[PDB]
């Protein structure tokens, strides 16, 4: 049983924008379905509902005239139209069954802002020869428009011990975060480290 | 709409402790009442629905109960993993509405930082800034005091701070603090300290670099 949601990036206000959820492994002539949307550092709100066959739909009293949702049975998908999007709409669309297998969720930014890639800076050590049997790498994200960057070690080789700290918002206006990672010190040298970071607001991927 | 009201809105206990999360609906729902969990960066999950049924795959220590207008969410005995916000929603009228939410927090023992300091690198300095970086690595309580040093100078208002989600395994925390100054500042100086105090150590660290 899967939902796979796809649409959303970086959108300007007043604009459209279509979200899409691909459903694996149920019946899904026969459930109804729901759009979930959660605002950054907020909670849960109903966005809408569709029946099982699309005879039916009801909308949040904020987005009624101005989102559509709808259905296409034979390719197993939910879609989300939106229009008139404001600051206000910017969230984690969910999508879920009526019986509550829910998607992952896609990111909506709205923004007028340019967007900005990052600056990547590596963060080591002051030589190899480290004072204790634990040593720290980082990277630090800097100066990109807008939220968020997400960073992998090694490709997704590297997962115990990574820590990917939350943006902070500098008088630029701009963000900026770091993510470390810490390892052996007898592994400086015959261990290559390399961070992935990836911005896709502004189609940036770097990796030192 | 039927407002739900979730209480409290911060739950901060230990592992092993009994955990009980209240939601209470404006009018009679019934028993059209289900729980979610939400851990950080994750979908929510069903845990609990029709007030009272474990959903699939659910561990046997989360069970739910109530009818009409009061709900409680149960945590028999809690885990490090439990560690996420959990919401309520009634199904029994449109619009669908969700409680505000109950952040549970996970009470562990005081863990001291593994602290790390960074230089500036390479590249940086070649547009005008010099960034400096203090970590406390896997620490518990989240309060702690990092302060900077340039030639034994105490620094003010050029460094920010910012601390990761509680791990959900380990319950600890984890702590950046950034000291960013002009490159031909970061020059006119050779000592750069990051000193800190915390409840896990009995005498302040220091971890410093020259030049």
């Known amino acids: 049983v899967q939902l796979v949601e796809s649409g959303g990036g970086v959108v300007q206000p007043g604009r459209s924008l279509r979200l899409d959820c691909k459903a694996s492994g149920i019946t899904f002539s026969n459930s109804g379905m729901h759009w979930v949307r959660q605002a950054p550092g907020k909670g849960l709100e109903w966005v809408a509902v569709?029946?099982?066959?699309?005879?039916?739909?009801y909308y949040a009293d904020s987005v009624k005239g101005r989102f559509t949702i709808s259905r296409d049975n034979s390719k197993n998908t939910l879609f989300l139209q939106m229009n008139s999007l404001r600051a206000e709409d910017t969230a984690v669309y969910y999508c879920?069954?009526?019986?509550?297998?829910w998607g992952q969720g896609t990111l909506v930014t709205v923004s007028s802002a340019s967007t900005k890639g990052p600056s990547v800076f590596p963060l080591a050590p002051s030589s190899k020869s480290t004072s204790g049997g634990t040593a720290a790498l980082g990277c630090l994200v800097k100066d990109y428009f807008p939220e968020p960057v997400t960073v992998s070690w090694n490709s997704g080789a590297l997962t115990s011990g990574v820590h990917t700290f939350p943006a902070v918002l500098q008088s630029s206006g701009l963000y900026s975060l770091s993510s470390v990672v810490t390892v052996p010190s007898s592994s400086l040298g015959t261990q290559t480290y390399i961070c992935n970071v990836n911005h896709k607001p502004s189609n940036t991927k770097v990796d030192k | 709409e039927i407002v739900l009201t979730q209480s409290p809105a911060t739950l901060s206990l230990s592992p092993g402790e009994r955990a009980t999360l209240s939601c209470r609906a404006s009018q009679s729902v019934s028993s059209y009442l289900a729980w979610y969990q939400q851990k950080p960066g994750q979908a929510p999950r069903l845990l609990i629905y029709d007030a009272s049924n474990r959903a699939t795959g659910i561990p046997a220590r989360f069970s739910g109960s109530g009818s009409g207008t009061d709900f409680t969410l149960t945590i028999s005995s809690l885990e490090p993993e439990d560690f996420a916000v959990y919401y309520c929603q009634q199904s029994s009228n449109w619009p669908r509405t969700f409680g505000q939410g109950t952040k549970v927090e996970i009470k562990r023992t005081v863990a001291a930082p593994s602290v790390f300091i960074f230089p500036p690198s390479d590249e940086q300095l070649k547009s005008g800034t010099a960034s400096v970086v203090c970590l406390l690595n896997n620490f518990y309580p989240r309060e702690a005091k990092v302060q900077w040093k340039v030639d034994n100078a105490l620094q003010s208002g050029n460094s920010q701070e910012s601390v990761t989600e509680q791990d959900s395994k380990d319950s600890t925390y984890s702590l950046s603090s950034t000291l960013t100054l002009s490159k031909a500042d970061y020059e006119k100086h050779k000592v750069y300290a990051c000193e800190v105090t915390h409840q896990g150590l009995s005498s302040p660290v220091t971890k410093s670099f020259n030049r």
């Open positions: 569709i029946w099982y066959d699309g005879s039916k739909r």
């Open positions: 879920a069954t009526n019986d509550d297998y």
